[PDB]
């Protein structure tokens, strides 16, 4: 059984991608839920779990069946504990892009997520670790990271830092195997 992964902070998206691209056997993603209509070639239980009733969803929600859920284009979307669960049962780390909120909800399900926080040392340090952004994008990212840390520090399984993404990525991989057992 494999603990799901929640990576937070600057470059978490590249981390998320690289783990998948490098270790596809050890990592995967769950199927999300949505109210919105199944399109032409789309598939129930592959693209999404589609829910017919906007209410049945809301019923499943408050019952806590979802670790995170929300509204887009006047339709609903969510990540069920279940869909996550089936990924984990498969022996695969479930890559999650979720609020730190979902971590509590995740712990509560006896699913034991590894929540890693990539910590920017400064503004400049964000620019070292992500070379595809402007100073101004970096300021915003450094600020999101400061609130994030200010708020959710205790939800973290680990905190990683580095002078390059390479170094960060390495720590991320170390942490995951170490806490995997």
């Amino acid at each position: 059984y494999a603990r799901p992964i929640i990576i937070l902070g600057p470059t978490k998206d590249r981390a998320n991608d690289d783990l998948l691209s490098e270790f596809p056997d050890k990592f995967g993603s769950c199927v999300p839920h949505t109210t919105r209509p199944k399109r032409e070639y789309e598939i129930d239980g592959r693209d999404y779990h589609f829910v017919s009733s906007r209410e049945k969803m809301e019923k499943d929600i408050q019952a806590h069946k979802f670790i995170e859920a929300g509204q887009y284009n006047s339709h609903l979307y969510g990540t069920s504990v279940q869909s996550v669960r089936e990924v984990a049962e498969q022996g695969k780390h479930c890559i999650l892009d979720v609020s730190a909120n979902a971590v509590r909800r995740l712990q509560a399900a006896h699913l034991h997520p590894i929540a890693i926080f990539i910590r920017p040392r400064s503004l400049e340090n964000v620019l070292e670790i992500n070379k595809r952004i402007t100073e101004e994008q970096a300021r915003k990212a450094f600020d999101r990271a400061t609130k994030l840390e200010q708020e959710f520090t205790e939800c973290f399984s680990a905190i990683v830092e580095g002078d390059s993404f390479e170094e960060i990525y390495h720590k991320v991989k170390r942490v995951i195997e170490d806490l995997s057992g």
Binding site: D13, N16, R36, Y48, A69, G70, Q71, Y72, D97, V98
Partner: peptide, 19 residues
């Protein structure tokens, strides 16, 4: 009220939502 990505609850539609 959702900003997320492939591995978010947005799933396949994350991209369309960035406009």
């Amino acid at each position: 009220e959702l900003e997320g990505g492939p591995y978010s609850p947005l799933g396949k539609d994350y991209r369309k939502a960035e406009g």
